[PDB]
Amino acid sequence: NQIVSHFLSHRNVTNELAEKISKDHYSYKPAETSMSAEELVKHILTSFHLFANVIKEGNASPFQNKQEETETDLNVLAKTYTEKTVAILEQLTEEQLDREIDLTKVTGRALLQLAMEHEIHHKGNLFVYVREMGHTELPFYQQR
Amino acid sequence: NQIVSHFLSHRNVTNELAEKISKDHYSYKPAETSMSAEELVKHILTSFHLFANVIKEGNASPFQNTETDLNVLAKTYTEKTVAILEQLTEEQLDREIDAFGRKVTGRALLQLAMEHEIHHKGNLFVYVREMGHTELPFYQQRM
Ligand SMILES: [Cl-]
């Protein structure tokens, strides 16, 4: 499964970086107009999961799903959302990837690439956050 | 040409961010073990071009191969990369490039080059924001 594998290649690094964020650094912002460390991390987690459900349904209906996540521990959020996203990705068929999703139009495949680049972008942000928090021994940005 | 289009979609933003770096902030480092502002941008520019040449040649030979203004470097390297990517045929993309002990298709090397750009641009957004610039582009143009 190259979709799941390629996702985890990047998401495993995101999760490892999230672990290096102490609870005092949840609020940490590089600049005044920046997302806080935890806003950044949660956005990475929820955004990919939204996209994964849009490809799964083929609809824009998962935007209507207001999912009130009660958990605040970033590491638990990271683990839970990774498991939920993998479970969706594992089942995605070539039909679901090939078909057009009509959004207020994009193929499942093209939205997946968009989801992957969004992850990669924000993990790119996250590396500088974590480096500024005192950590100097950081993973390579992608696992093999 | 979706290869060139998709490249410029991100590279145009990288260049736009590099324009916001004054010559006083060339040496700027967010942390002690970070690349400077100019080291980050130069690396983005040279790394994509290197990969582009590897796909172009089908060899690891491009590994065997003066300007300091970051805006001129960005313009020059973008033009050189585009010219290489414009010429890439489906044959070059499909073929296995053989040094490394493994092997990779030109297509796979291109994605890897694209993700390296997106990653480092991800870094560069935080650098530039920290340097006082708050009105920043969306991370990709919709081309
Ligand atoms: Cl420092």
Q: Give the separation between CA B95 and CA B110, rounded to whole angstroms.
A: 12
Residues in B closer than 8 angstroms to A116, CB to CB, are 115
**Has residue B93 been placed in a domain?**
yes
User: What is the enclosing helix (H) or strand (E) of A100?
Assistant: strand A100-101
CA end-to-end span of chain A? 14
Which residue is listed with tokens 């001129």? B72
Q: Mutation target for A interface from B14, B118, B140: give the one with most A CBs within 10 A.
A: B118
Tell me if B123 and A122 make a contact (CB, 8 A cut-off): no
The type of residue at A94 is E
The shortest C-alpha distance from B73 to chain A (Å) reads 22
Asked whether the beta carbons of A35 and B136 are under 8 A apart, the reply is no
- Binding-site annotation, residues of B for a divalent metal cation: 43, 116, 120
Tell me if B31 and A120 make a contact (CB, 8 A cut-off): no
Q: Give the separation between CA B56 and CA B87, rounded to whole angstroms.
A: 8
Cα three-residue angle A43-A23-A126, rounded to 5 degrees: 40
Structure tokens at B84: 């290489």
Method: X-ray
DSSP H helix total and E strand total for chain A: 5, 2
Q: Give the separation between CA A65 and CA A86, rounded to whole angstroms.
A: 19
Which residue is listed with tokens 């040409």? B1
Residue environment code for B39-77, b if the CB has 16+ CB neighbours within 10 A, otherwise e: ebbbebbeebbebbbbbbeeeeeeeeeeeeebeebbeeb
* DSSP-assigned letters across all residues of A38-96: HHHHHHHHHHHHHHHHHHHHSSSGGGT---------HHHHHHHHHHHHHHHHTT--HHH
Closest listed residue to residue B89, CA positions, set B107, B112, B113, B116: B107
* Cα of A41 from ligand 1 centre, angstroms: 23
Structure tokens at B21: 């770096």
Helix B37-57 and helix B70-87, axial crossing angle in degrees, nearest 10: 20
Q: What is the CATH classification number for the domain harbouring B22?
A: 1.20.120.450
Give the nearest partner residue to B125 out of A120, A125, A136, using CB atoms: A125
Structural domains of chain A, count: 1
Q: Give the separation between CA A32 and CA B131, rounded to whole angstroms.
A: 11
**Has residue A115 been placed in a domain?**
yes
Tell me if B122 and A127 make a contact (CB, 8 A cut-off): yes
Tell me if A34 and B119 make a contact (CB, 8 A cut-off): no
Structural domain that includes position A87: 1-135
A105 CB burial (10 A radius; 0-12, 13-18, 19+): exposed
Residues in A closer than 8 angstroms to B122, CB to CB, are 120-127
**Has residue A141 been placed in a domain?**
no
* Reported resolution, Å: 2.3
By residue count, chain A amounts to: 144
